[PDB]
Design a protein around this ligand. Structure first.
Ligand SMILES: [Cl-]
Lengths: 315, 315, 315, 315, 315
């Protein structure tokens, strides 16, 4: 996830363009056109203004990393919902634990149906709905009701409607004994369902393409002025601030490390759900929230220790 | 949606103003006034300070793109409301499903009445209330009660009041069986109704016109210093840092690409509801939220699969 | 609301100070003190650093426009409250509609009592409480209970207490039939009452006076260096980068347009409730929210169309 | 509260250090060490870079004024709680109004116990708990239960626990008739109690001391380069851009006005609860919220005018 | 916690690299390679641009200190939960106070299980679950149910599920007499449980490693240009702006104090839960919230003073 694995495709390209026009400057650039080349090394360095290109990167990247962080906070986690389903949806019997496992499956299913439409790392795991059936998130007969819906949009909201038709059926049977308990379930669904709704909206509406193009112009307009205006010309010709020939442009690479590396921060955070190294481990999070929910609402329902005293009960 | 479709109206204008004063400088600008012109190429370049004009664009555009993003988050979506109406408003009969379809129509109607007053792409689809009647959002007799209201303001809030008079009538008939269920409906209306209220307020109160005018001065004060202070004068006259004649101002266009392109980000995001390419697809969102609501509260009400076991029921 | 109506009081002042010390420089400034004046045109231009003065304006104005926008979002609007009073407070009779009109009057009254203490445009409309009685927001006998309160603070919170004593009286008589309905009323009052509380606090605590004074020093320290360090001296004396005499300082006015215009953004947004052109139209908003509330809770209570089918009922 | 009362302790110090090394430069600095002094006026001015010191102040002060504003928004105000206690806690009798006055005293007491631990202006008013007893916020026998708690931490949360033991006792006696009314009281306590909890946390965790020290280095590293690199040396020695002797460094004080004044914004906002002029008037707010609460829940409980018609009842 | 304890490891290193190449420049650098060294002191100072390195630090550190502050606000505090458990969970008997102490132990336990996985200062206090048993947060038999859960993830959420199975058992026995009281408990758990969930997510997702590497390049690319381009060469050779020899680079250390000290702000705030001096005192907060919760829900339950009159009861 470091800078050396992203920049080396552009680093060997920058050495391949710099020293090719520097070594051939000594021999292939003849004296009738070497004089034509000395007029540019004080020209391209004149308009090479490195404050506004460092300015436009600063306000663009902090727009991205604020948007990249807000994409992470709206990750669909069922952890705030598994504490309500184990609290409210009751019953030790076969039907009672079948409600709690199904209700958390619908929340786990509707986090898969949105993450397979925004993450390439999840879509390579669930390419079709047959792979969501065989994983265990959707049953065989819920795939018939899913695919017989006349809708040409994304159908990630469908299990969040099956949640409400199931939580209202548990209320009618008395497995949600209270009435604020039933309101608490639908309150904590719409917080979860809005978290799936934000990830659809950060994917639908991106950072604007022209503002991505303006910063990409400015960095790649700088590296054309830097490519020519910081060339090592002949020392014996007696120019202003030019009587040396390092024959290796050692410092200007450190301004390619830093300017293009600043832009490469914004490149891999413009769509952080991909197969990068600093991506959100979404396939880790799908297997996590599906495992710990079926642990919490099924094998931890009303399984408590004895109410025994504390160590500090009278100390 | 790229930068080449917005800037070319100003790009051919900038070549038409630069080289017209550069080609006629050699011939039409005679020697008695060529000497008058050489006094300006070191003068307009002296006060051409490109750090503060790049400064004022940075803080202005990030005000816009934060306001442009906050305009998008307050888009009226009925998705958080269709999970409550299918959960609470009950009844399989003719009257029961007529409540759920009407209640989501009033939310869909009151998202149209505000988006046709803030979006030009929606107002070209619904120019009059007769086009909202014929689309299906308002019935023929709800248009009589709409137009017989003595109000000279925007009447987008009217279906959100019809929502409350209908949801309180469903409660009195027992189709909202609970009491926290009825409170949950009016709670999730005022979240939706405030989302319509924000879009009226981002439209009513804009980015201030003087702050739009300050940045427009600074960019167009720079391109008058750049138009004269970066002219290619004669090489044989022996000036400071001027003994070349490219005859094509190749780099200064790359500072017109980037400065005016930075401002053009703020131009098309100052009113993102128009007919641009990176606009919010509001006509897509109106047809989406009206279709998937009448799917969710009518054809998906209490239509569940059998409660069948998971694949991981004992694994 | 443009920049030409705010800056012209300082624009004629800047021409009156620039060319007065430029035209009298040629004639009134004699040669024994013309030599004393040439020592300053390369001195005041030396310390004329235009990056930090453009820096301090950038972080100060974006503090203001974020505070100016947050002042607007806390505007007291009764629109979120008129949907609850028409939903919960019932009764078609004389007493029942007298509850709904009074309850929305108290919310409309307590938005006037705070906006007449923060807006000069409202205080010129309601100079005394007799003008709030004659407008119709406070009755004749509620002015006796208002003025017989031993309190030396602002009494904007008084109608929000009359709201709670009335909404608890409607609950005791059964005109609020439910119990979550009564909780929903007091929940949506404290959201409204905190909106009146924020406007009292943005008015009580301002942008700090020293931080307003630091930016006002820096702009007016720049325009003393610009007033002298950018003077047009004699061309025939042979100075560095000075052999011209435009006799009209055309570009330096474009740095007065932009620096002082940037500060004038922060001047008219430091108290946006005044009588400016880009002010919040508070007198428009007071007449709006008082009209559409008495329309919504009185003439639209339980006045619905027939529940008739949609156009898409089986399509 | 202006800049002239904070900077004059450093302004007379800056004149006392500048002209002491300028007047003694002409006479006490002899010619063998005057030549040693001319090597520094072009050296200290060389590294005197005023863009990064203006940079580090910009991002540091806007961290402070955002934290200073967030300290103000978490001020403990009982105004959102006095509308619930007058609404829910009932009874016209002696015991009924003794509940409402005590419940708002506990909220008023627990705003004093935290503000006397974060404000020096309140701690000079309440130095001991005996001064909180004699002011009237804590009774004589609640001081016995307060001081007999084995706790070595701050005990500001103690009246917020007495609030819950009293509001649950009013519910058991039927003076809170409803059940959502009792939930609304404890909901609006934890909003108030978190407001007292934030002020303890802005006081406990400050702006980091190293980041306060970095900006203090940079400003006071600038004023050592400015103290020497902008000295007025002899005009007759013929240096670069130095042939004048104003004998009064008039412009460099305007860069001490602005750089040190920018830092002095962050000095008096790093702890805004002190005895400054732009402090939050906390002793005004303690006497305000204690007076208007005992007015609202005691002398305004169920004291309404007659329900009389509006001026616009049929117009 | 100051800057002198962090920078001295790099401060003695910077003197050890500067004057080693300055003292040996006079003697060890012979005249055939002293001429080779004079070509670099005007070269490394040429590309030493200190505005963009001060730029990239500004936007990076304010990302950190906003993330460092948001890490602090999501600290798990049981103070908002101890007011609900003393209010709702009733009973003076042995079983009744055993519910309140256990319910606040589970909140105190689930703040330890997450802080021992994000703080090194807590993990050195609780290295194993046997040290959480012996401290008193987990009983001997709750450690059997904890370690017999088939889960390979972090099990910090386990006591928040034991909270819901206990709060639903107290409701079934009538120790939570109401129904909104039971909803208020699970509402204020999910606020607390999300606070533990954020600290797991600020630890799981950090500031991106490439953006940490870009700023570390730019500072350490500056201090190679500063190490050579600001060397004190011989005065008698007659170079541009170089005829002095301080023999102690006094000002350039003040740009190492400030640039590296700015980065050291971001170094110790990138993981503020460690054993630093400005860390969050988490071991103070664990002992605080465990002590004051067992004080508030056990020894302060229904222990009130007599309802006695105020000092201002008729004044
Ligand atoms: Cl509720």
């Amino acid at each position: 996830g470091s800078i050396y694995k992203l920049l080396w495709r552009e680093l060997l390209c920058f050495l391949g363009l710099f020293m090719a026009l520097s070594a051939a400057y000594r021999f292939v650039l003849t004296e009738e056109q070497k004089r034509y080349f000395e007029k540019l090394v004080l020209y391209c360095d004149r308009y090479a203004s490195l404050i506004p290109v460092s300015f436009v990167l600063g306000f663009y990247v902090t727009l991205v990393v604020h948007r990249w962080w807000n994409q992470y906070l709206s990750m669909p986690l069922t952890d705030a919902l598994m504490c309500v389903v184990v609290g409210t949806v009751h019953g030790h019997d076969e039907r009672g634990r079948l409600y709690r496992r199904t209700l958390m499956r619908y929340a786990g299913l509707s986090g898969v149906l949105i993450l397979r439409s925004v993450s390439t790392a999840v879509f390579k795991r669930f390419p079709t709905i047959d792979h969501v059936v065989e994983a265990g998130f959707m049953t065989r007969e819920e795939r018939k009701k899913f695919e017989n819906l006349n809708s040409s949009y994304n159908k990630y909201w469908v299990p969040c409607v099956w949640f409400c038709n199931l939580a209202a059926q548990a209320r009618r049977e008395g497995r949600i004994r209270d009435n604020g308990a039933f309101k608490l379930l639908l309150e904590e669904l719409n917080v979860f369902r809005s978290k799936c709704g934000m990830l659809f909206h950060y994917d639908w509406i991106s950072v604007p393409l022209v503002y991505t193009q303006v910063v990409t112009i400015a960095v790649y307009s700088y590296f054309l002025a830097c490519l020519i205006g910081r060339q090592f010309l002949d020392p014996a010709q007696g120019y202003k601030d030019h009587d040396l020939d390092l024959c290796v442009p050692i410092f200007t690479l450190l301004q390619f490390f830093f300017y293009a590396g600043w832009l490469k921060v914004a490149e891999q955070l413009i769509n952080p759900f991909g197969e990068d190294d600093d991506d959100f481990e979404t396939n880790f999070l799908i297997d996590r929230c599906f495992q710990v929910s079926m642990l919490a609402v099924d094998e931890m329902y009303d399984d408590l220790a004895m109410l025994e005293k504390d160590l500090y009960w009278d100390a």
